[PDB]
Every structure is written in C-alpha cells, then in structure tokens.
Amino acid sequence: GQDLALSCGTSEASADQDKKKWEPDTKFLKSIHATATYQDPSLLSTVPYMTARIFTAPATYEIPIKGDKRHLLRLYFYPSTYTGLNISNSYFTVEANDVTLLSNFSAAITCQALTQAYLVKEYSLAPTDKDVLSIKFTPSDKYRDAFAFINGIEVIQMPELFDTAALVGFTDQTMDAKTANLQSMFRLNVGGQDIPGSQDSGGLTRTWYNDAPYIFSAGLGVTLQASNNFRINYQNMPVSIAPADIYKTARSQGPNGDINLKSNLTWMFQIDKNFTYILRLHFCEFQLSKINQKVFNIYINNRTAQADTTPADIIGWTGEKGIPMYKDYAIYVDGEEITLQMTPSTFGQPEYYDSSLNGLEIFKMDTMKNLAGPNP
C-alpha cells in the first residue's frame, strides 16, 4: 500500500524540485492533454504545473484506496495560457466521492486576488467505507465555453489526527471531528521559517509557512528559538501531528509585562463565510520550566477560547519542558475573517506576563458534505 502522486497530463514519470516522483494520471481515468505556453518565474518546478488534463464534459478519476482510513487529497492548479483555450472560460466543480470540494471555481480569478501563480487546494477526507475514491470534474453549465482542468492530484493515507474541538462561545460544548471532511486553509510555523513538504512529519509532505504576513497588531512580537541540541519529547503524541521544527520556535509578546498586558498579539485570516472552522494551536515550552511562569488568554473572533479561571499554561498542560501539545477550537462564522488574539492573564499572578504560540492550522469543515466557497 503506497501513496499516489499523479502529474496529470503527462505520459511518463517526472520529479519535482524536491525530486519527489510523480506519475501519469492515465491509469486512473475512468481526454485531452495540454502543455502551458508560459512558465511563470514563481513556479518552484515544472512538475506538475506545466502540464494539464482538459475536461470539456464531466470526467472521473478513480483511485484505489482503503476506505477504512482517512486520506489527504491535494489538487494542484496552474491557471496559465494554453493553446486554443481561454483560461478565463474555466468554471467547474470538483467532488471527492460524496463531498463537494469546489464549485463555480475560477482558478484564474482566485490567483489574481492572491497574487499567486498557482493554487494547491488540499483536503482531508473521512473514512468512506468505499473501496475507491472518485474525483469528478464537472465544467459549469452556466457559461457557454466552460471547461475544467487539473495539473496534479495527490492521495496520501493519513492517521486519525482529528478528534474533538472546543466551541469557543460556550462553557461545556465540544465538537466531534473524526468523521468530518476538512479543507486546510492556513498551515503556519509561528515564529519559524517555511518548512517544505519534504521536511514534514509522517510522510504527509505538508508545508508550514511563516506567520509574519498574518499579524494585524502593531507590534510583531518577539520570536523565540530553542538551541538545536534541544530535543522535543513527543511521548505518546503521534509524530504526524507536526514536525519538531514547529515546536522549536515560537512567537511571543515580549519581555515588558506592563506593556504586554495592555495589548493582544493578533493574527487574522481571510476565510469563507457560512462554515465552521477548527483552529489547531500548537505549543511547546522550551524556555520556562514550571507551572505559573507564563499564563495567558486566548480569544477567537472576539470570544473566549481560554480565559477567566482556566487560561492557557503550557507547562500547566504538559507538565515538563520540551513536551509538545495542541488544542483544537471550533467557531462558526456568519465577518469574512478569523481573528486569533493573545494577552497575558493575571489569574494566579504568574511569574511573567507573556503569551506564546508555536504553530497554527485552520481547517474548514463541511456543512452537509460541501466545502465549497466563492471566488475572491
């Protein structure tokens, strides 16, 4: 049981900048191949972006999978100039079995908003109890010359890394996420450098990005880094949750407590309205060593994630320096942003007045098997 990396409209194997091996998509199609006229300088590689499969009717890929298990699915789109196609005519839908991923999706308009040359839309699909994963591409019937296209598909089997999340508005409300279909919206290494997929845990090849572009607060904090002899004690936590490089850097508020108290450390993100999101906050304390040295509040969208008499204390939760952990929080959104905020807590008079975060993932959950939002 090996994983798949299909470089779509190609006839033979290729390797990307990370010399990750790709293979052709031909075996799995249940069509037209095109090569993009133009190589944009922002591409990290030729593979799998330069080549595409073009659908003018509905088309289905069927991948053999173990439907017992959850899967990571990536769709790689390169909206560029192709001979005899106007990429501004591309509007289509994509479904993965019963889940709707994309709808009236314009790769062209999306990229022009995000000032990007290419998109990677990634999903985590729940166990299906179906032997095969079918991805169906459906060009829009609401535009006269619609077509669908795809540059690459990966299907990676992954462990059950989702379980429950706390609902921020409320005292006792928890949510179940083990049967949920998710879209990864942001995956950040807070206080750290970008981590390429070839450096990620569990063979999942996720990318963790630097968080600096998401700070709305005036101050950019103070970044912290552990010594590179520092070893992270995962213990029974699965290694797949995140790579150790996440836990060996953090971004904090700083050493002036008087000033810290009067401010919030603020990240904010653009998301799709009418969905519930899970915020996964990663933590590891590599400087302090005991409970009640650093104690701080967490708020998501002007509501309490952890505050009052139960604020965050990393070693309070973990019990020892160098042990990683995470907490999941859910929020429903309907206002097109998600705001994360941190400030220190006076509860228990901690030795310091600071707050710290090591990493952050934001997942979108399906409302009745649909993850599709609008175009920017």
UniProtKB/Swiss-Prot annotation:
Protein localization: Cell membrane
Gene Ontology CC terms, in alphabetical order: apical plasma membrane; pollen tube tip
Any GO molecular function: protein serine/threonine kinase activity
Keyword annotations of the record: ATP-binding, Cell membrane, Fertilization, Glycoprotein, Kinase, Membrane, Nucleotide-binding, Serine/threonine-protein kinase, Signal, Transferase, Transmembrane, Transmembrane helix
Topology, Extracellular side: 2-376
Keyword Kinase among record annotations: yes
Phenotype of the disrupted gene, per the record: No effect on male fertility and pollen germination, but siliques slightly shorter. Anx1 and anx2 double mutants show defects in male gametophytes due to premature pollen tube rupture.
Residues the record marks as carrying a glycan: N86, N104, N264, N274, N302
Protein task: Receptor-like protein kinase that controls pollen tube behavior by directing rupture at proper timing to release the sperm cell.
Family: Belongs to the protein kinase superfamily. Ser/Thr protein kinase family.
Other comment: Male paralog of FERONIA, a female factor expressed in synergid cells that controls pollen tube behavior. Named Anxur after the husband of the Etruscan goddess of fertility Feronia.
Protein name: Receptor-like protein kinase ANXUR1
Protein species of origin: Arabidopsis thaliana
Gene: ANX1
Part of the intact protein present: 26 to 408 of 850
